Structure formats: structure tokens, C-alpha cells
Amino acid sequence: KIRTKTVKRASRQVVEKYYSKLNFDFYQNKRVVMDVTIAESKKLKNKIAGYATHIMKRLARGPVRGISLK
Amino acid sequence: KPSRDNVYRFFFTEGVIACKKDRMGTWTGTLGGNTFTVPCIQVMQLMRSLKSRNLIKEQYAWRHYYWTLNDEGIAYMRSYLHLAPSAMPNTQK
Amino acid sequence: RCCVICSNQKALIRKYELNVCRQCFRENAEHIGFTKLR
Amino acid sequence: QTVRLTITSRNAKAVESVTSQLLTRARDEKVTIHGPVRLPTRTLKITTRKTPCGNGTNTWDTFELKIYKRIIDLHAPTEQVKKITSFTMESGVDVSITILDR
Amino acid sequence: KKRMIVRDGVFYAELFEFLKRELAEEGFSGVSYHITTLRTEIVIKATKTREVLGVNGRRIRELTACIQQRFNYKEGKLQLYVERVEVRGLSAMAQVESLRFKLLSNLQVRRAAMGIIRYVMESGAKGCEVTVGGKIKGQRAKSMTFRDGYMIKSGTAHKSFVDSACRHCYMRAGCIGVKVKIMLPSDSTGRNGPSEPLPDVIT
RNA sequence: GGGAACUUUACCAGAUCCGGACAGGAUGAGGAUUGACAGAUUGAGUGUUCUUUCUCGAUUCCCUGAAUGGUGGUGCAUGGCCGCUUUUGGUCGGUGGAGUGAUUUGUUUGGUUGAUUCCGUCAACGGACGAGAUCCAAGCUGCCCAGUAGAAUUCAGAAUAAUUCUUCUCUGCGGGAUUCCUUUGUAAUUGCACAAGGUGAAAUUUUGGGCAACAGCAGGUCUGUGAUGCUCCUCAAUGUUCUGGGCGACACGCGCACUACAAUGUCAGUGAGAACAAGAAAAACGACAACCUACUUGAUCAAAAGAGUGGGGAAACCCCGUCACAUAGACUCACUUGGGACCGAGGAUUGCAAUUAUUGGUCGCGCAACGAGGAAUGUCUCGUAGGCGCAGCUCAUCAAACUGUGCCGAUUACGUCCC
């Protein structure tokens, strides 16, 4: 429910480095994670994929730390 | 007793000697030809005898003893036998 | 029933599966292939 | 003489590292092999109190094993099995098997 | 086949405990083992490998023919090997025999360990901890721990990265215990991509 | 890992032994010696011992020094291991800043979280541990797979043996879970999030565990261990004895901890009858099978027993009690058709020996308390307590113990800080 800085941080490197992950789908935005990221465990990606969609969705609200190259 | 001679002899052609510690008749050896036995309690009484002499290299683990003979033990063991080419370990490999 | 690693015949020794390891405890004696899980 | 293989070993990537891999020495070659699945797994569970002493928080260990049995079945090659098993060298603690029946 | 694994467990437990006694100063880092047919050979892992072979065959054969004579195999079914352990540093069990030797040599403690700390950390190790407990500086039941680098003590992940040894040094006046933990430079050993908390993102 | 006897055994009463390594030394013509029948000696057909001769083949025995051995002490000299502080979320450093300094900041108001967990703020910035995460088992699921798993079907047969498969089981590696939609919800321009609800086997560290920092505690262990420092013992020994016998376990209703039994008409007591469970175990070498269990005899006469056959190296096994039974069963306003304690008589059993080993063994004692428990006290919230029971561990014999599996299955809070 609360995400460790490890989930938080790595998920900020993905969104910084991948706009392949777009849809608010946890499931699409998940299947792009695990191929690109090695966390060696599923929950990490399951966490990461969950927070990675929070970031993207919120970007549409406004700016977010770790600002895009836009 | 001559038992005590061949145990000596039994180092040769064997080298390192293995004995489990029991207080009971047991023996692992005499092996190439006869392969018959002697009680360990008496084996143990022989090793200590000249173990106070440098001839022998102690090891121990679990309940087992491990005896290898120091060079001074090779030479003595040769001459006590009176037959002395040298111990098997250094004779070939 | 004196047992394997020591004179013991005490620190009652597991017969279980006939491995008799308690002398020097099955904690100190290991590499048996046991693991610590659960 | 349809032969039988019982591979009993604990360690990670042995029970697999023979039967999976090393039957393809026979599996994909002139032999015809009948694979079943590995039999069920066992655990050998001893539990000893952690204290060398008397005093404790009353705590216990649980130590375990896993023994992994695989059955793998054949028709009869003659003398090939002696060559079959001997093809492949790779494992440790894994089990060699000599069986006849039926 | 329950008890055929146990007989090997009790067996393997016997080899390791025995060699430690008699492979020392010779850098005994462990044993690997398997057998198939009439070959019980038992490779030996070690650091200092010319004292195990010996001048003329002695030490390796002197240790060979007792294992035929301990476990009763008919003569010739055993072999022996020794395997050079690459990067002598990274193996703790090699380096307790370093500490034991060094403290027997009468060294003071801090100088003793802190060297090994460098040698291991030099060797590529990712961390260390060395701890000497005992009667050092007498009448104290004084213990000391000497740390480097970085390390993980929790979870069962540690048992992969953590390979350590706890061995006694018998001094006059008492005992002095010695314990070394070390690291594996996560790189080539295991490498499961292994400390969980490191995720990577291919870019 | 305390469930015993002699063993284990430390304690007691006696008796044996060298284990006493090493030689640097006074009798090497019936040898200081080793072992001995009888006879006595003694508790002992035990040779220690005394006689009697021989059996003696030197390694032993005598004298010195050393020594070895030990459940000897000291856990307050010590390693290692263990518990505890410590169920929580804590700890540490480098450079920088403040302070003469001990020290401090980082490590924080605030919000949230089991969480020094997050976000925000920030004289701190960047890093190390602990948390988390890795792990292990349980739950739904994919692939492989079945002759040491088990279903479908047709064909014939009693009572109105061929076929194809993976539903059920097997297991290695994988899928799955995530805060994902929704609620204008609570809170809130951010944020981190929370809730009621949805999907799903699972819905909020999914569930139960294992692990687990840094400092400490004169915490426990010298009875685990050729693991160890002293310094006590060293041969009519604190050593050893399948050494002999005794204790560790005794009866002042003594005081105390934990457990099993239970007194009801809610199985309630008991007699029969119907169903159905699961983790687990099983074995022998320096010899020519000693472990379990199914079947059927023991059965023209109890029970437990005895004995013979039969395969299992473990996927040889599945009929456990709780319950169900109105089977029209028997009790029946009571210390009682409910305590099983105390009890003396037979008898079967493991085995060196049981003088209570123990028991679907009988069958006598019942009239020994006992009749919801004084203050005081224990531990948990969902397959849970409780109830029930089964193996395992010790184990030649014995579970009211612990370790684990499964069955029956609950009311109360979904809270507060009052203790």
C-alpha cells in the first residue's frame, strides 16, 4: 500500500526513460516493465507497474518530479 | 606379542592408518593377503607407546583416529621390521 | 547407544532416520543437506 | 526388457539437470523413451531446541530436506542403456539406475 | 530412498570435518563431491595447493588411502584432486586460517584483521566483517568487530552472498575466537542478478 | 530435548583396573611378567586375592620424573552456541554546518503507513544497516505426466475382460496481486494515502512462518563435543568398569508451576449400528533374518497372547474419535446404570534382571475427594478459540510431555489507551 523508495525511484527512471508506457492500463504498462526491467522478483514489477501508471496518469494532470524531455 | 609386529608392518603398503575408537575388539587391516583382525583397545595401547616418540602424525575426527608416520617413523618402522627399502608412500609416486 | 561424534550417550540423540548426529549437535554437524526453512 | 529410471537426489538443478537434459541423449536419438512425471516430493523434518543449555525462550528449529524422485521409462535397447546412461556426464549427487521388470 | 541421502549427508559431513583438521595453513576452502561408478574421487578445493600434493606423493595420497581405509572402499576406487581457488581473497574459510595463523604469530588484533580487510576488499570483495572475541587484553570478555564496504544480514538472501567461517584460536590463558564473513562480488558468482533491491532498467 | 532403574549416573555402599606414553636408572638361571583349574578368599563357578603346581613367549612389572584421564570446580577467566533487552522500528558513519566542549545537525514540524514507510518541508548533502524485499509452506491456475495416481465407455457374465482419456491425484518451472477501475466518497488544487464498494480463489504487508541491525545483560551452558585457561584428583582414583547392589521417584494430605480426568439428560452414561481424514514412519555388519503391516489359523470356547504364510527400501495401503442413529435400545430428582483412586487375587507380554515396567487382561474395591469453583490469574479475532483424534520424537519396555498433520467449529470487539 505504501511503496518503498526502491519502487518509487526505479519507477521514476522508467517513466523518465519510457513513453512506451502510456495507457492507464496496469496490464499493458506492466508487460512493458518486466521485459525492460530486471527486479528479479514479481512483486517489485507488480508494485512498479502499479506506481508507473500512477505517474503517467498524473502527468496528464500537470508536471511531476523527474520532468519529461518535453 | 607378535601381534604388534604386523600392525607395525601394516603401515607399509598402506601408509596412513585409520581406526575408529571403541573400547572393544575391532580391526580394519592386515589386508593384502590375510585381511584379519586384532582388537582396537590393544591397537591404541601400541600407538601411544611410541607416539611419545615423534614417529607418528596425529589426526582425529569424530570417533576415528588417523595415523600417518613421520619420516623418523618411516625409518624406524623399516628397521624394526629389519626390512628397509623405505615406506611405500615415497617408493613410487 | 553411544553416538557418532562424541562419547556422549547423552544429549539424547535422534534415532530419527538412523542418522545419529547429536553428539556434536546436528547444529554444529551439518552440510547433511538440511535447511533452515520454516 | 523395458527399463526404468529412478533419479533420487536433493540438490537444485540436478534432478532436473539430468532427466530433462540428459535423456535427450536417448530421447531424440535411436531409443524410444516413455516419460512419466517425477513421483511426489518428500521432506525429512527434524526439530531440535536451539539451546545447547537449559535456558530458553522455549525455541525450536525445524530442519528439512527435499528428496526428488523421477521415474522415466523405456522400451528395450540392448547394451544401449549401458551406453545411454554413460553418454552424459553432467551432475552431482544424482542417481544411476539399473532396473528390469515385466 | 530416504536413507541413501542421509548416508551421503553423514558421509559428506565426515569429509569436511576431517580435512579442516588436517588441511590447514594449506588454505582449505572446502570440498565438492560426486561419484558414479567405482570412482569416489572427491575433489578438494584449496588455496595453497603444493602442500596438498607434496614433494613426492604423500599428502594427497596420505589423505587418499585413509579415506579408502575409513569408508572401506576396496583399494583403488578413490582418486583425489585439488582445485586452485581463484582469487584467494573471496573465500572466508581460506582466510580464517589466515587469521588463526596470524594471531598464533603473536600479532596484535587490530593490525591482524584490518590487513585481511584490505586483502579481501582488495580482491574484489564487496564488503567484509571481521570479529575477534576472546580474552584479548585480559580480564575483559572483550569483543571487537572490524567492518568494511557493505553487507546484508537479513533475509535468507544473505546465505547466497554470505559465505563465512567461525573458528577458534587456542591461545595461552584461554581461547580467542575468530570469525570472518566477506562478500561475493555479486558479479560472476551466483549473479542471479542477485541482491533483490537492485533492479535494473534496460535503456 | 528428564519417559529411565542395572546401563546411561554424575550421588551412595564396596570391589576391579592402568588407561602408567616416553627413558635419563639398583636383582635379566627356575625372569620384576601376562593369564589361569581346583581349593579356600570374597557378594560373586570373577580369580582380585591365599595355597598348588604350570601358562608365561617381556610390550609388561619395580624405582624416579613426566603424565594422561574426568559429568572436578570457576559461565565471575573464555570460545561457540542460546535466551533476553525488543514485536517494536530502530541504528551508524564520511565531508559540511552550529558549539571552548561533552555533544549536535543529518535522523524534523506537519500528513500518512505495521514500518526512520512515504510525500512535503528542510544546514545539510550524499551513503551503510534494520524495515521492506529475497526466501519456505498454504490457497485459484498454466505446461509436462503417470504401470508405485484414477476416472469414461462399450462387450459379455454373476445380483430383478477390450478400449480411449486427464475431471479427480503426481510435480519442476511458470501465471495470478497490483492499490487496478468506481464512488464528484474521507481527506485534499500538489502529495502520500484511507474507506465503503467492484472484479477474483485470493483484497491490503493474500495467508502462516523463516530471517533480522546496532549496542548490551557478569542472563544459561566448563552435563553436547581432543572447545578451551587455571588447579583439585592420579592407582586400596573424583579415571574406567555391558562391575555388583541402592538412589535419583521416598510420604508431614506440607506450599507452588504446567498438564490429563471430569461431575450432564446439550452424547448423558453404555450397547449396537452408519459414514469418512492427513501430514509420518518402517531395515542390520566384516555373521549363515533381528522393521513394520495386511490374511488366516490360535477358536468346540475368554481378553491381550502364541505361531505360520504374504510384499514393502516406501504413492503397502484409507475404515481414529468429535459426529451421524431415533435404532421406538437401557437407564432414570441421584454421589447415581456419572470419578476411575486406592485395593488384594490370577494371567499374557518386551528382556540379563521387573520385586506393582505396561495392559481391549480379566474382576473384587466404589462408601476416595468430588457436586461450576475465594481473592487472584491465563491467550488469540477466522478455519481462529474450543472440542476431537492421529502419527513422530525417547523406544527392548512405557505419553497425562513436546513436535506436526488432519476432522468439528464457535459467540466479541473490526475498538481505546483506562489498566
mmCIF file with all atom_site columns, N, CA, C and O in Angstrom, chain A residues 6 10-11 15 17 19 29 40 43 46 51 55 57 61 64-68:
data_model
loop_
_atom_site.group_PDB
_atom_site.id
_atom_site.type_symbol
_atom_site.label_atom_id
_atom_site.label_alt_id
_atom_site.label_comp_id
_atom_site.label_asym_id
_atom_site.label_entity_id
_atom_site.label_seq_id
_atom_site.pdbx_PDB_ins_code
_atom_site.Cartn_x
_atom_site.Cartn_y
_atom_site.Cartn_z
_atom_site.occupancy
_atom_site.B_iso_or_equiv
_atom_site.pdbx_formal_charge
_atom_site.auth_seq_id
_atom_site.auth_comp_id
_atom_site.auth_asym_id
_atom_site.auth_atom_id
_atom_site.pdbx_PDB_model_num
ATOM 1  N N  . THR A 1 6  ? 12.510 2.289   -3.234  1.00 0.00 ? 6  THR A N  1
ATOM 2  C CA . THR A 1 6  ? 13.008 1.491   -4.345  1.00 0.00 ? 6  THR A CA 1
ATOM 3  C C  . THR A 1 6  ? 11.962 1.374   -5.439  1.00 0.00 ? 6  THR A C  1
ATOM 4  O O  . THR A 1 6  ? 12.244 1.644   -6.609  1.00 0.00 ? 6  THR A O  1
ATOM 5  N N  . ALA A 1 10 ? 12.935 3.531   -8.931  1.00 0.00 ? 10 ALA A N  1
ATOM 6  C CA . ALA A 1 10 ? 13.059 2.844   -10.214 1.00 0.00 ? 10 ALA A CA 1
ATOM 7  C C  . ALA A 1 10 ? 11.902 3.199   -11.128 1.00 0.00 ? 10 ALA A C  1
ATOM 8  O O  . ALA A 1 10 ? 12.100 3.481   -12.314 1.00 0.00 ? 10 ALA A O  1
ATOM 9  N N  . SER A 1 11 ? 10.695 3.243   -10.579 1.00 0.00 ? 11 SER A N  1
ATOM 10 C CA . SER A 1 11 ? 9.538  3.619   -11.371 1.00 0.00 ? 11 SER A CA 1
ATOM 11 C C  . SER A 1 11 ? 9.656  5.040   -11.903 1.00 0.00 ? 11 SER A C  1
ATOM 12 O O  . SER A 1 11 ? 8.981  5.398   -12.873 1.00 0.00 ? 11 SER A O  1
ATOM 13 N N  . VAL A 1 15 ? 9.462  5.869   -16.167 1.00 0.00 ? 15 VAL A N  1
ATOM 14 C CA . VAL A 1 15 ? 8.666  6.933   -16.765 1.00 0.00 ? 15 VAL A CA 1
ATOM 15 C C  . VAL A 1 15 ? 9.559  8.009   -17.354 1.00 0.00 ? 15 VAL A C  1
ATOM 16 O O  . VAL A 1 15 ? 9.248  8.592   -18.394 1.00 0.00 ? 15 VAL A O  1
ATOM 17 N N  . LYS A 1 17 ? 12.436 7.363   -18.667 1.00 0.00 ? 17 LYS A N  1
ATOM 18 C CA . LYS A 1 17 ? 13.036 6.766   -19.853 1.00 0.00 ? 17 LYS A CA 1
ATOM 19 C C  . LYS A 1 17 ? 12.085 5.973   -20.752 1.00 0.00 ? 17 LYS A C  1
ATOM 20 O O  . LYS A 1 17 ? 12.543 5.471   -21.781 1.00 0.00 ? 17 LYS A O  1
ATOM 21 N N  . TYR A 1 19 ? 8.248  6.313   -22.624 1.00 0.00 ? 19 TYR A N  1
ATOM 22 C CA . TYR A 1 19 ? 6.893  6.689   -23.003 1.00 0.00 ? 19 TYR A CA 1
ATOM 23 C C  . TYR A 1 19 ? 6.223  5.656   -23.891 1.00 0.00 ? 19 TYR A C  1
ATOM 24 O O  . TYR A 1 19 ? 5.224  5.967   -24.535 1.00 0.00 ? 19 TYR A O  1
ATOM 25 N N  . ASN A 1 29 ? 0.845  -1.432  -19.103 1.00 0.00 ? 29 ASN A N  1
ATOM 26 C CA . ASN A 1 29 ? 2.006  -0.788  -18.506 1.00 0.00 ? 29 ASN A CA 1
ATOM 27 C C  . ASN A 1 29 ? 2.810  -1.766  -17.662 1.00 0.00 ? 29 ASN A C  1
ATOM 28 O O  . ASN A 1 29 ? 3.925  -1.451  -17.242 1.00 0.00 ? 29 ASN A O  1
ATOM 29 N N  . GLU A 1 40 ? 14.226 -9.032  -10.496 1.00 0.00 ? 40 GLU A N  1
ATOM 30 C CA . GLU A 1 40 ? 14.430 -10.401 -10.029 1.00 0.00 ? 40 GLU A CA 1
ATOM 31 C C  . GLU A 1 40 ? 13.235 -10.934 -9.240  1.00 0.00 ? 40 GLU A C  1
ATOM 32 O O  . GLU A 1 40 ? 13.184 -12.141 -8.979  1.00 0.00 ? 40 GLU A O  1
ATOM 33 N N  . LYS A 1 43 ? 6.703  -9.195  -7.405  1.00 0.00 ? 43 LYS A N  1
ATOM 34 C CA . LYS A 1 43 ? 6.078  -8.106  -6.653  1.00 0.00 ? 43 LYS A CA 1
ATOM 35 C C  . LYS A 1 43 ? 6.696  -6.761  -6.980  1.00 0.00 ? 43 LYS A C  1
ATOM 36 O O  . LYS A 1 43 ? 5.977  -5.769  -7.135  1.00 0.00 ? 43 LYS A O  1
ATOM 37 N N  . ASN A 1 46 ? 5.174  -5.857  -10.007 1.00 0.00 ? 46 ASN A N  1
ATOM 38 C CA . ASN A 1 46 ? 3.771  -5.635  -9.704  1.00 0.00 ? 46 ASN A CA 1
ATOM 39 C C  . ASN A 1 46 ? 3.577  -4.335  -8.944  1.00 0.00 ? 46 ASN A C  1
ATOM 40 O O  . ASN A 1 46 ? 2.665  -3.562  -9.252  1.00 0.00 ? 46 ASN A O  1
ATOM 41 N N  . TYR A 1 51 ? 2.694  1.663   -9.713  1.00 0.00 ? 51 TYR A N  1
ATOM 42 C CA . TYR A 1 51 ? 3.039  3.055   -9.485  1.00 0.00 ? 51 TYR A CA 1
ATOM 43 C C  . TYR A 1 51 ? 3.397  3.733   -10.796 1.00 0.00 ? 51 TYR A C  1
ATOM 44 O O  . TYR A 1 51 ? 3.163  4.936   -10.967 1.00 0.00 ? 51 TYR A O  1
ATOM 45 N N  . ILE A 1 55 ? 2.096  7.480   -12.091 1.00 0.00 ? 55 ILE A N  1
ATOM 46 C CA . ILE A 1 55 ? 2.895  8.580   -12.602 1.00 0.00 ? 55 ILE A CA 1
ATOM 47 C C  . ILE A 1 55 ? 2.344  9.059   -13.933 1.00 0.00 ? 55 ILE A C  1
ATOM 48 O O  . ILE A 1 55 ? 2.017  10.240  -14.090 1.00 0.00 ? 55 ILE A O  1
ATOM 49 N N  . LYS A 1 57 ? -0.581 8.601   -15.593 1.00 0.00 ? 57 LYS A N  1
ATOM 50 C CA . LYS A 1 57 ? -1.887 9.224   -15.434 1.00 0.00 ? 57 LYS A CA 1
ATOM 51 C C  . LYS A 1 57 ? -1.782 10.621  -14.858 1.00 0.00 ? 57 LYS A C  1
ATOM 52 O O  . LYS A 1 57 ? -2.451 11.543  -15.339 1.00 0.00 ? 57 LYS A O  1
ATOM 53 N N  . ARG A 1 61 ? -2.311 15.334  -15.457 1.00 0.00 ? 61 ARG A N  1
ATOM 54 C CA . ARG A 1 61 ? -2.838 16.351  -14.556 1.00 0.00 ? 61 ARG A CA 1
ATOM 55 C C  . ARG A 1 61 ? -1.980 17.607  -14.581 1.00 0.00 ? 61 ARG A C  1
ATOM 56 O O  . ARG A 1 61 ? -2.494 18.727  -14.491 1.00 0.00 ? 61 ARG A O  1
ATOM 57 N N  . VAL A 1 64 ? 5.314  16.617  -12.928 1.00 0.00 ? 64 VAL A N  1
ATOM 58 C CA . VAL A 1 64 ? 5.674  15.652  -11.898 1.00 0.00 ? 64 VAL A CA 1
ATOM 59 C C  . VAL A 1 64 ? 7.185  15.579  -11.825 1.00 0.00 ? 64 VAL A C  1
ATOM 60 O O  . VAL A 1 64 ? 7.875  15.650  -12.844 1.00 0.00 ? 64 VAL A O  1
ATOM 61 N N  . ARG A 1 65 ? 7.702  15.418  -10.611 1.00 0.00 ? 65 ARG A N  1
ATOM 62 C CA . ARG A 1 65 ? 9.139  15.409  -10.386 1.00 0.00 ? 65 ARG A CA 1
ATOM 63 C C  . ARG A 1 65 ? 9.800  14.386  -11.299 1.00 0.00 ? 65 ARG A C  1
ATOM 64 O O  . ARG A 1 65 ? 9.196  13.375  -11.655 1.00 0.00 ? 65 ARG A O  1
ATOM 65 N N  . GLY A 1 66 ? 11.039 14.650  -11.694 1.00 0.00 ? 66 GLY A N  1
ATOM 66 C CA . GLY A 1 66 ? 11.587 13.888  -12.802 1.00 0.00 ? 66 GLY A CA 1
ATOM 67 C C  . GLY A 1 66 ? 10.903 14.234  -14.107 1.00 0.00 ? 66 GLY A C  1
ATOM 68 O O  . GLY A 1 66 ? 10.314 13.360  -14.752 1.00 0.00 ? 66 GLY A O  1
ATOM 69 N N  . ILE A 1 67 ? 10.943 15.510  -14.490 1.00 0.00 ? 67 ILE A N  1
ATOM 70 C CA . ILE A 1 67 ? 10.167 16.041  -15.606 1.00 0.00 ? 67 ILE A CA 1
ATOM 71 C C  . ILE A 1 67 ? 10.660 15.473  -16.934 1.00 0.00 ? 67 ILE A C  1
ATOM 72 O O  . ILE A 1 67 ? 11.851 15.196  -17.107 1.00 0.00 ? 67 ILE A O  1
ATOM 73 N N  . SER A 1 68 ? 9.722  15.253  -17.857 1.00 0.00 ? 68 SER A N  1
ATOM 74 C CA . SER A 1 68 ? 9.970  14.679  -19.171 1.00 0.00 ? 68 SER A CA 1
ATOM 75 C C  . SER A 1 68 ? 10.811 15.607  -20.051 1.00 0.00 ? 68 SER A C  1
ATOM 76 O O  . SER A 1 68 ? 10.978 16.804  -19.782 1.00 0.00 ? 68 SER A O  1
#
